């Protein structure tokens, strides 16, 4: 057991990554009533392994990875954030403030009764509400408070112990209440309700007929023979444009026998045209027919957007389906706001390239990774989380969470505004969201493992129960209020309570249960509540440690 | 300048991530004769920023990220490794040993002349050949050596200084010689030569006609009306199988007017069938027609693989193109080795599902991420890099590099053998390869920044020139030998020299210049040379520090 501990402490990489492996395993496992979050599995694994020896927490590792997690969350919700805000901002901020005042009142009422102290009280606050800066705030506060050095040392030792005692439950029990008990209580399904709430907003588009380019070998005896490519393109209805005979786009070459006519358009229209002209389709050994996404530069005329078809170029929505000609006027640009609309040009390389150069600039493929963009994002997230101020002598700061969310939001919004620059693949963003918070949790659990059982031994039974009460009851009361009176959206209420409590494990877990469809809406509903609750709790800890004097 | 330094040292996250942003920028920039590696840009940025204050290097950060980089390299080359080995293993190991003996002889000849000492000699070795364990080996060696404490302290202080002095050049100049001067010297292009060398091996398949399922509305007046689906499927030649009338796979329902016949097969064959039967194509609003990749369980009969077509199921290669019926015998499984071949089943959900259950199990989509697999991989990479032994009192160990490469190799090979389990997306693997080594470089450069200029001031001019010579000349001599005599593959020689020198920046840079096509072949050509050179250099440092006495 001690050789195990020596090897472990001497190999932190292995100690931490084996914590994540078994953690994700425990998360995957389940009995029936939903499953355990990968985050919760990693937490359990880390708290158990930490019982072997002593494990020093790196604050330049868990910090980096929590930054990754929150910046990914913020960078995914960038576009859909403003809309979900304009939709439910009033309701979500009301819920956040209701939960905050209810938590304050509950903590005050519980600390009025029971053997209670200011250090233990601040520890219960920091632990049961999942706030690791309340410790620092209340510690500096009690330092400023005019008390004997012995009492100050006593409280400064008591606070972190009770924090780690209540932290396990503040992370697990509240998560299980918000993710499992709370949906079933509102008589809904988390996944279905979330995906339908997101569909209700313009962020989950429906499938579209991809307007592609087919190739047809002109066998002998067809009415198209001897006829000019331009004449055929004219004969083609709307949604169908003759991409070109053979591999050229000259609308003057005569269609001869044995050539290959390429046509761009929707599948149904192309099938009808094939039946009418009895066309023989062929694989088409040619790459000279490519589709390109172009971001329209304001003041683009549209005369070229109109002559697209007459030029052998199919213009379609960014989704893919060929766009109605009149809809060229929805690409108007007026007033300001400027989320530039993007077109898709299909056809011959020369014609498509000229129409693109006339319309705008090529949109960057999401598959490409903008390493410098990601690096600057993380750097500025850190620089903004370091920012802070003092309120009544209490030091407060955005911290990693709120600053990372804000930087992700603004950076994703700017990238969506200027779509010519590369971005971060959503696969990488999901990987960050999943791995960063779980590494943070593994480190903090390895650090607070032995401490947790020590606190269970000393002042364990009563304090842990009081902390569980303080953590769950505010959620119950604010949920009752919100749902049964204000009648807010269930997923919106869940996001608001997850934010107001600063429970980042809830973010990750509810997102992985809801899927990448309504995950943007959930993150949007969380972010503002997250910031407000972070501030008010970092201030709530010290006011309590002062009141208790 | 000092407020800058205070803010920087107080915000390591920002200090490191702004180093990566500007680093990737400097890498992107270029004049004409190729560009600067993103790694080299990050190195320059870190060495310049480090000139502000003092920056402590986290060994549980750079270590994790270098592990990520090397494990990604090893996990991508898993499948293609064994083949490239069987192809050029003799040549690559010959090149590795030739380079090692030439470097040893060059170092000995240069240390015989010039004001030379054992500490400075070991420092030049550790710096100009990019080996940060030579420091530890030679330090423990000189510790064991029976000398006055003053001399031991003198040498132990001299070694790291000369190491950091020569490290910048060992990372930049040798990289520029192997990536730019060396290809042009062999009169080739790195990208083209690499991609064609990889094409020469079965790892870059050519495009294939994707055998898809089309839908055709049975207008009135077609010869298929009143005819049974089974009869039509029979009438369909090879490569064409009637997926089913409407949305069912019963080969007894009569084809009525207004129904929709779905047909699976290649585009050319389907076009010929459409022309012959004058079929009207339609978008097809149905998901009940799906394609599934199945891993064949040994002892699968093939009778079902034969009845696939007669059942309304198109069997195709994993690539997509419908496979020749006789080729069902290439899916034989015999002897052992067992890289189970996978089929693709297209058609109706019920028929395809039954044929799959009869043939094998569903292959996992690469888009899914196996977090537990990745975690266990990193953990075991660390546990294996910790392994080591002693040779003549010299401590040696696999370290992070060789152990991570071995674990990646074996884990990727096992996942390719058992394809039912998820994997790591190649996008994530590329992101790791790019970001991990560059973070390692940023940290080590921030740490060795002030030290580098200090060493430039003290014993700077002569030592840096001698180190540049020791670093470049071995490459020149071994390249001459290999190319102009042994006549090995250019890309193979480059990979062998990159491995033998333990220059991980060369791995990353040459891979990003060659692309994901021949990058597996390059990593395969590197790995063995990497291990052998790592060992022989960790042993070469101490033997030199001993000889110099």
UniProtKB/Swiss-Prot annotation, chains A, B:
<dbReference type="InterPro" id="IPR006512">
    <property type="entry name" value="YidE_YbjL"/>
</dbReference>
<keyword id="KW-0813">Transport</keyword>
<dbReference type="GO" id="GO:0005886">
    <property type="term" value="C:plasma membrane"/>
</dbReference>
<dbReference type="GO" id="GO:0042802">
    <property type="term" value="F:identical protein binding"/>
</dbReference>
<feature type="transmembrane region" description="Helical">
    <location>
        <begin position="159"/>
        <end position="178"/>
    </location>
</feature>
<keyword id="KW-1003">Cell membrane</keyword>
<comment type="function">
    <text>Catalyzes the electrogenic exchange of aspartate with alanine.</text>
</comment>
<feature type="transmembrane region" description="Helical">
    <location>
        <begin position="526"/>
        <end position="548"/>
    </location>
</feature>
<dbReference type="InterPro" id="IPR022457">
    <property type="entry name" value="Asp_Ala_antiprt"/>
</dbReference>
<feature type="transmembrane region" description="Helical">
    <location>
        <begin position="4"/>
        <end position="26"/>
    </location>
</feature>
<feature type="transmembrane region" description="Helical">
    <location>
        <begin position="461"/>
        <end position="483"/>
    </location>
</feature>
<keyword id="KW-1133">Transmembrane helix</keyword>
<dbReference type="GO" id="GO:0015297">
    <property type="term" value="F:antiporter activity"/>
</dbReference>
<feature type="transmembrane region" description="Helical">
    <location>
        <begin position="88"/>
        <end position="110"/>
    </location>
</feature>
<comment type="similarity">
    <text>Belongs to the AAE transporter (TC 2.A.81) family.</text>
</comment>
<keyword id="KW-0472">Membrane</keyword>
<keyword id="KW-0050">Antiport</keyword>
<feature type="transmembrane region" description="Helical">
    <location>
        <begin position="434"/>
        <end position="456"/>
    </location>
</feature>
<dbReference type="InterPro" id="IPR050144">
    <property type="entry name" value="AAE_transporter"/>
</dbReference>
<keyword id="KW-0812">Transmembrane</keyword>
<keyword id="KW-0614">Plasmid</keyword>
<protein>
    <recommendedName>
        <fullName>Aspartate/alanine antiporter</fullName>
    </recommendedName>
</protein>
<feature type="transmembrane region" description="Helical">
    <location>
        <begin position="33"/>
        <end position="55"/>
    </location>
</feature>
<feature type="transmembrane region" description="Helical">
    <location>
        <begin position="368"/>
        <end position="387"/>
    </location>
</feature>
<feature type="transmembrane region" description="Helical">
    <location>
        <begin position="117"/>
        <end position="139"/>
    </location>
</feature>
<feature type="transmembrane region" description="Helical">
    <location>
        <begin position="391"/>
        <end position="413"/>
    </location>
</feature>
<dbReference type="Pfam" id="PF06826">
    <property type="entry name" value="Asp-Al_Ex"/>
</dbReference>
């Amino acid at each position: 057991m001690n050789a195990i501990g020596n090897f472990l402490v001497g190999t932190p990489v292995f100690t931490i990554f084996i914590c994540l492996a078994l953690g994700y395993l425990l998360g995957k496992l389940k009995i029936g009533s939903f499953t355990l979050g990968a985050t919760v599995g990693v937490l359990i694994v880390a708290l158990l392994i930490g019982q072997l020896g002593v494990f020093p927490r790196d604050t330049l590792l868990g910090d980096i990875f929590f930054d990754f997690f929150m910046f990914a969350i913020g960078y995914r919700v960038g576009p859909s954030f403003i809309s979900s805000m304009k939709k439910f901002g009033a309701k979500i901020v009301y819920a956040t403030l209701i939960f905050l005042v209810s938590a304050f009142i509950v903590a005050y009422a519980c600390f009025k009764m029971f053997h209670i102290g200011p250090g233990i009280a601040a520890g219960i606050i920091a632990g049961g509400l999942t706030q690791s800066a309340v410790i620092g705030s209340s510690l500096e506060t009690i330092s400023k408070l005019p008390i004997s050095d012995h009492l100050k040392t006593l409280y400064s030792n008591q606070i972190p112990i009770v924090y780690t005692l209540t932290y396990v439950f503040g992370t697990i029990g509240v998560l299980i209440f918000l993710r499992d008990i709370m949906p079933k209580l509102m008589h809904i399904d988390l996944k279905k309700q979330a995906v339908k709430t997101a569909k209700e907003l313009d962020m989950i588009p429906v499938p579209v007929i991809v307007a592609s380019t087919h190739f047809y070998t002109i066998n002998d005896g067809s009415s198209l023979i001897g006829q000019t490519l331009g004449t055929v393109n004219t004969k083609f209805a709307k949604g169908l444009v003759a991409a070109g005979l053979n591999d050229s786009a000259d609308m003057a070459s005569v269609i001869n026998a044995g050539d290959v006519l390429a046509i761009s358009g929707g599948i149904d229209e192309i099938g009808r045209a094939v039946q009418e002209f009895n066309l023989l389709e062929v694989t088409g050994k040619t790459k000279a027919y490519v589709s390109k996404q172009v971001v329209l530069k304001k003041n683009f005329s549209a005369d070229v957007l109109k002559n697209a078809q007459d030029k052998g170029v199919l213009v379609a929505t960014l989704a893919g389906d060929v766009m109605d000609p009149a809809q060229f006027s929805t690409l108007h640009h007026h007033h300001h706001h400027k989320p530039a609309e993007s077109v898709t040009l299909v056809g011959q390389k020369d014609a498509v390239s000229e129409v693109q150069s006339q319309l705008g600039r090529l949109r960057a493929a999401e598959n490409i990774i903008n390493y410098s963009w990601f690096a600057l994002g993380i750097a500025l997230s850190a620089a903004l989380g370091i920012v802070g101020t003092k309120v009544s002598g209490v030091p407060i700061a955005l911290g990693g969470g709120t600053a990372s969310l804000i930087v992700g939001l603004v950076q994703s919004i700017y990238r969506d505004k200027h779509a010519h620059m590369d971005t971060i693949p959503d696969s990488l963003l999901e990987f960050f969201q999943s791995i960063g918070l779980n590494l943070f949790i593994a480190t903090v659990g390895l650090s607070a493992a032995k401490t947790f059982i020590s606190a269970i031994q000393s002042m364990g039974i009563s304090v842990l129960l009081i902390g569980a009460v303080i953590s769950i009851l505010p959620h119950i009361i604010t949920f009752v209020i919100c749902y049964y009176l204000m009648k807010m959206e269930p997923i919106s209420i869940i996001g608001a309570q997850t934010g107001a409590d600063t429970l980042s494990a809830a973010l990750n877990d509810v997102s992985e249960r809801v899927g990448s469809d309504a995950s943007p809406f959930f993150a949007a509903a969380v972010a503002p509540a997250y910031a407000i609750g972070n501030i008010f709790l970092t201030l709530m800890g010290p006011i309590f440690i002062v009141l208790l004097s």
